[PDB]
RNA sequence: CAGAAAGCCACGGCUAACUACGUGCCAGCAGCCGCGGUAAUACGUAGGUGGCAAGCGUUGUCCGGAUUUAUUGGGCGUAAAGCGAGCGCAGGCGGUUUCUUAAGUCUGAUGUGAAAGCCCCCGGCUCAACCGGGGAGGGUCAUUGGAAACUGGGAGACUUG
RNA sequence: GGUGAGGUAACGGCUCACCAAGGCCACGAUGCAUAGCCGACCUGAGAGGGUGAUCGGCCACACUGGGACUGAGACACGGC
């Protein structure tokens, strides 16, 4: 033990699977020959146990190992709660 | 099953060797680890161009060092030093 | 085509003495061809830095593929001017220690002499026309059959002898005494019509 | 709608000084004040003062001419436009005019100038050039 | 301003035309010529003038050629810093060089900056190629040019602050 | 344009053609291939022969080789030298460039380094016209 | 024993090199402009000259010259180029100010970015290439610590838009 | 996606049975054409364009397509 994984602090968007939501972290970066700032995202489908976070909760995710069909994510820490 | 060697680096008359270090699974001048020392194949008597420091540390992993090695290293005593300070250590 | 021009249509066409003012004037002022002396219009520059650069390549008889070589290793330097600094480099050919020091009398004999292994330089044999000598090789003459009369023929011909090397005919020894500069060896041929011709060549 | 104030200052400067009279009124707000204090410090704006009611600013410009009536300064333009922003680091510091001029870099620590910045080998983005 | 013609100059005449203009019959046919004069130490000047044959017309532009004369502030046989100009399609880009390297310059240019006295140079034309503009926006580039004791005297700084 | 106007559009470049189209052979055999094919030259056969006259103003009558290449297209190539030593149903060997006499003709077939001989009058041009060193 | 050791394409301009004659709307030269057509430095001979140089012409392909896809580095009154005009989803950019934050940003330390590569320092092959020793280059990289001006997130304020 | 079981050096719908209908996409999913990738290069002032030979590293292939066995290591280039 001397490493974790790279916790994602994204938002959750679907929640619609059972102990399965799906968090979505965003950052920005250049382009490669002109100068501004884009916006991209990808999706990762987090594995929860009984499906806390509602839609739209932020939580920080941390990887554990190959579940699924390479889902590959897990909760960590219901952060805020919409309402 | 780590080993040392030895390289060409000829041109068409002339040669010149080098020594290198490797596992024994990899071609001759193909892949290797690090790198272990050299001579001159000509002017006798030629250039015995050696580290001597990663021998005895390489040989404590445990490896076989090659016909010309023990040779041409106890000209220098490094295989003389090998069971001199191992099989004495 | 190494050297054949026999120092006169060279001296003619470009127009310098080529380079000690060794001359053969009576024929030299106009050109050759079927118009001698009933010449045209003015000369445009492109054969301007045509001829001059011809001038300086036909100081040594040599490449033009070297010069360029020998033109890129000047900028290594990184002081001074990169015209001034080949203008050195120019001058440290094993046959302008020959022509220098006073063994000889002309390029093509030092090159003739050269050759055929006829000197060595601080005990060890010297083949090639174009090595590089720097300065600390005190040049030799190989004393095994220096009695040949034709090297103090042009050693006893006291005709061009230049004073930045430190020589003994004596001996026939000496060396290459120290760096030369612009001010003193040859003028008056270039500092800048090399560099700017050798940008668009 | 103005969506960046400072080129409005600079283009202001450019006007009044490109006809040549001296005096100038612009709002302002805390970093056109540190731009107003840098051309004071460099020589190229006679004096600055500042008069506040209840709402912008304002920073009143008096521009610096010479004795034949020339100009001191000669052109301004801005880099890091919004839209895109341009940032320098500490071995990628501009000198304009060699150095004839000046550039400013908003550093971790305020307005200075370009020589102070290889000054302290830090950097930032650059706004504008002045010369 | 009226730098006088008590200055030893050269000259070198750049590019002429031979220029028409119809009468009723014949063809009218006259020359012009485009003369820079300069006295390679800092002061160079162009002009024209137009005639019925070659000599006439170069020596009526050295007659106009002597009435402008331009200062060229140079430091080291280079420019201060880099200046560009232009005059109707004549982009001109100058840039200092590095000592002993040469004028890397076309044509026009260089029969400009080679006569002013100036060693080392780079530059690049750019946009119209026609030899007047090349020549006028030329003179106006280098008309555009500073130098350090000039400028720390017009701020009110000194000089060696800034260099 | 405005720079994010730039992101979305890639700026295209100005993809350039060439005048020489006949040496890209997408051949025939046996399963009507691809070109992958930059040659100097292309050796062919001939399918008629005749002469051909310019524009205006130019006259004079200059003389051809029509040729198809083993791809079963076929151009029309012109002959350098003086003597043609080709003839009706012969190999020949193409070099590329384009001539301004008339429409349709953008190649010129070799002379002395196959079939063909070259030159007999030439002793001055002797690399050009495939004939060199006489002894004369 | 100077004996065995010399070859290439043009010369109307761009781009150094001239003569005599023939075919004289034609035989044929053209990289492009462009020649011809009885007085051709352009068709062809013959001599004169020119530039590389045991290597030198032709042909094809790739980058430049090209600011002729322009971020660096172009502009749309007449030249090629503002939709016939409005309304608005998403998207791009946003007035002044207090406190916080630290995602962007600047900065240190550490591990790595194979060896031969290119360059530079040093050296040997008679020099030279070739080979040898040592570090800079290739991260838009990963961890870890600060900086809090500008952009971005959170709480309040103001009246000019 | 969940449930459990089989199976696997090893996790896993890799595979079986049950419960739901979930997943990916305008930032380009899926489709069509061309190409082995890289360290590197006798181009450029530089930003960047062109080529993937040497020589070195990785991947894949053995007249075409399937399938295993021995052997720890192969679904094996001169094994079946």
Same mark, same amino acid.
């Given at each position: ?83 | ?89 | ?201 | ?131 | ?15 002429? *035309? ?22 390679? *130490? ?18 009526? @532009?050295?007659?106009? @050629? ?81 130098? @350090?004791?000039?400028?720390? @005297? ?10 | ?136």
């Amino acid at each position: 033990e001397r490493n974790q994984r790279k916790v994602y602090q994204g938002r959750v968007v679907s929640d619609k699977m059972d102990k399965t939501i799906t968090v979505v972290v965003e950052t920005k970066k250049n382009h490669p020959i002109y100068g501004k700032r884009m916006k991209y995202s990808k999706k990762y489908k987090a594995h929860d146990e009984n499906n806390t976070a509602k839609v739209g909760d932020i939580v920080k995710i941390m990887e554990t190992r190959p579940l699924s069909a390479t889902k590959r994510f897990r909760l960590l820490e219901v952060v805020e709660e919409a309402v | 099953a780590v080993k040392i060697r030895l390289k060409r680096m000829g041109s068409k008359k002339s040669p010149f060797y080098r020594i290198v270090v490797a596992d024994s699974r990899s071609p001759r001048d193909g892949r290797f680890i690090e790198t272990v020392g050299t001579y001159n194949p000509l002017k006798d008597p030629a250039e015995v161009v050696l580290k001597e420091d990663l021998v005895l540390d390489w040989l404590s992993k445990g490896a076989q060092p090659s016909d010309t090695v023990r040779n041409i290293l106890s000209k220098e005593g490094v295989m003389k030093k090998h069971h001199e300070a191992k099989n004495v250590k | 085509s190494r050297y054949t021009g026999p120092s006169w249509k060279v001296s003619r066409r470009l127009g310098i003495s080529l380079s000690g003012t060794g001359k053969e004037l009576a024929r030299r002022p106009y050109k050759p061809g079927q118009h001698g002396p009933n010449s045209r219009g003015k000369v445009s520059e492109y054969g301007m830095q045509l001829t001059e650069k011809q001038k300086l390549r036909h100081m040594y008889g040599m490449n033009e593929r070297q010069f360029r070589t020998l033109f890129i290793k000047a900028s290594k330097i990184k002081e001074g001017k990169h015209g001034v600094n080949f203008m050195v480099l120019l001058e440290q050919r094993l046959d302008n220690v020959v022509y220098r020091l006073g063994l000889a009398t002309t390029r093509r004999q030092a090159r003739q002499l050269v050759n055929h292994g006829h000197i060595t330089v601080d005990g060890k044999r010297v083949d090639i026309p174009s090595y590089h000598v720097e300065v600390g090789q005190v040049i030799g003459v190989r004393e095994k059959s220096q009695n040949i009369s034709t090297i103090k023929e042009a050693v006893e011909a006291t005709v061009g002898r230049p004073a930045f090397v430190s020589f003994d005919t004596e001996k026939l020894e000496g060396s290459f005494t120290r760096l030369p500069e612009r001010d003193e060896l040859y003028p008056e041929i270039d500092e800048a019509l090399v560099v700017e011709y050798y940008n668009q060549k | 709608v103005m969506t960046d104030p400072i080129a409005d200052f600079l283009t202001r400067i450019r006007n009044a000084n490109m006809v040549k009279h001296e005096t100038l009124e612009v709002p302002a707000s805390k970093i056109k004040r540190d731009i107003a204090e840098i051309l004071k410090r460099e020589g190229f704006i006679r004096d600055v003062e500042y008069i506040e009611d209840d709402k912008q600013g304002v920073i009143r410009v008096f521009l610096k001419y010479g004795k034949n009536e020339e100009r001191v300064i000669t052109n301004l333009k801005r880099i890091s436009k919004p839209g895109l922003r341009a940032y320098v680091k500490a071995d990628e510091v501009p000198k304009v005019l060699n150095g004839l001029g000046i550039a400013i870099i908003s550093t971790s620590e305020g307005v200075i100038t370009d020589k102070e910045a290889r000054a302290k080998n830090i950097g930032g983005e650059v706004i504008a050039y002045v010369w | 301003y009226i730098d006088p013609k008590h200055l030893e100059l050269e000259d070198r005449v750049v590019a002429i *035309n031979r220029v028409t203009k119809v009468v009723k019959g014949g063809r009218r046919l006259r020359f012009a010529a485009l003369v820079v004069v300069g006295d390679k *130490n800092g002061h160079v000047g162009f002009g024209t003038g137009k005639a019925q044959e070659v000599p006439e017309a170069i020596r009526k @532009a050295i007659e106009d @050629a002597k009435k402008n004369l331009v200062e060229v502030p140079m430091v080291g046989s280079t420019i201060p810093h880099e200046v560009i100009g232009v005059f109707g399609g004549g982009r001109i880009l100058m840039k200092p060089a590095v000592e002993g390297s040469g004028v890397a310059a076309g044509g026009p240019v260089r029969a400009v900056l080679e006569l002013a006295g100036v060693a080392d140079i780079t530059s690049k034309s750019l946009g119209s190629n026609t030899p007047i503009n090349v020549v006028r926006a030329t003179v106006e580039g280098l008309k555009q040019l500073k130098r @350090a004791e000039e400028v720390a @005297a017009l701020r009110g700084k000194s000089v060696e602050e800034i260099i | 344009p405005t720079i994010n106007q730039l992101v979305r559009k890639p700026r295209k470049s100005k993809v350039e053609k060439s005048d020489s189209p006949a040496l890209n052979k997408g051949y025939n055999s046996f399963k009507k291939t691809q070109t992958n094919v930059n040659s100097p030259q292309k050796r062919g056969v001939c399918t008629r022969v005749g002469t051909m006259t310019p524009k205006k103003p130019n006259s004079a009558l200059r003389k051809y080789a029509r040729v198809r290449l083993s791809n079963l297209i076929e151009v029309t190539a012109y002959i350098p030298g003086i003597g043609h030593n080709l003839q009706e149903h012969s190999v020949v060997l193409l070099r590329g460039g384009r001539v301004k006499d008339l429409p349709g003709v953008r190649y010129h077939i070799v002379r002395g380094a196959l079939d063909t001989a070259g030159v007999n009058d030439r002793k001055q041009s002797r690399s050009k016209y495939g004939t060199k060193r006489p002894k004369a």
